[PDB]
Design a protein around this ligand. Structure first.
Ligand SMILES: [Ca+2]
Ligand SMILES: [Ca+2]
Ligand SMILES: [Cl-]
Length: 307
């Protein structure tokens, strides 16, 4: 069939913007169950200087919109902790300012092989803003486009409503997903999680809802990304910590080790820097290992295939 390269070249020669026949910018690509609201617009119509990737592809670029696909977004965020893996999914040679023909592509691991998914860059908007996933930088479009490509792989945006983080992790790595009930967690699980993150394995977690917020700042039935583990010295003892990211890009733990916790004052300025401590409402936060195990019920690890 026609490769991305073939289609891209063709559009450039005809000086036309690609329109995807198989996943067109209309209601069919949005939903399946019902017929029901959004204007489709390409990023150069949304803003004056759109960019595919600004300041690197990282986890601050993944902010959930009006679609319940946290399971997928938590996994993208995890993937950005591992830049060399990330660039297999997101081909870097793509631009709005050079050889632009309104066509992009992404690679996913599917039937024991990398498959290429091609999309046009039309995206759902309302009042000229993205309604679905966006970057916290208003001119950056890779994450919105990746979501679109993944929606195409599943037939519609609506098909991304509900899923398991481990499905996305496998689709991005070709690794093998493993589950832990935190209830049955062994004594050394801090160490297990630490070794996994250092190995570049993707890790997500959630609080089971038997399938809007909690007082402590956590969200039930919601995929979080595990983005770090570390030990800090605090009042003469070493304290084990866990870092998580809510793929909403906001709404955080408000307990100990949270952003605004006063007893951060007792931590040395260099240690703060090593932990990348920042008081910012970005969805990312430290919490104690002890509080983590106490609130979270499910931990999912995707182990990279021993090449
Ligand atoms: Ca970025
Ligand atoms: Ca924060
Ligand atoms: Cl660009």
């Amino acid at each position: 069939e026609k490769t991305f390269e073939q289609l891209h070249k063709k559009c450039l020669e005809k000086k036309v913007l690609y329109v995807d026949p198989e996943f067109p910018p209309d209601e069919t690509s949005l939903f399946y169950s019902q017929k029901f609201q959004f204007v489709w617009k390409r990023p150069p119509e949304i803003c004056e200087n759109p960019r595919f990737i600004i300041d690197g592809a990282n986890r601050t670029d993944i902010c959930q919109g009006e679609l319940g696909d946290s399971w997928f977004l938590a996994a993208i965020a995890c993937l950005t902790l591992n830049q060399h893996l990330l660039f297999r999914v997101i081909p870097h040679d793509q631009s709005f300012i050079e050889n632009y023909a309104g066509i992009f592509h992404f690679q996913f691991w599917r039937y024991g092989e990398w498959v290429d998914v091609v999309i046009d860059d039309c995206l759902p908007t309302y009042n000229n803003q993205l309604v679905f996933t966006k970057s916290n930088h208003r001119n950056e479009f890779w994450s919105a486009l990746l979501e679109k490509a993944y929606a195409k792989l599943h037939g519609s945006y609506e098909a991304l409503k509900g899923g398991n983080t481990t499905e996305a992790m496998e689709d991005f790595t070709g690794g093998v997903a493993e589950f832990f009930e935190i209830r049955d967690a062994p004594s050394d699980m801090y160490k297990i999680m630490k070794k996994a993150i250092e190995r570049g394995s993707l890790m997500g977690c959630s609080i089971d809802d038997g399938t809007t917020r909690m007082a402590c700042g956590l969200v039930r039935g919601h995929a979080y990304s595990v983005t770090g583990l570390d030990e800090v010295p605090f009042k003469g003892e070493k304290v084990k910590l866990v870092r998580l990211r809510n793929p909403w890009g906001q709404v955080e733990w408000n307990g100990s080790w949270s952003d605004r916790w006063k007893d951060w004052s007792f931590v040395d300025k260099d240690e703060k820097a090593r932990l990348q401590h920042q008081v910012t409402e970005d969805g990312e936060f430290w919490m104690s290992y002890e509080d983590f195990i106490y609130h979270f019920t499910k931990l999912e690890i995707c182990n990279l295939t021993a090449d």
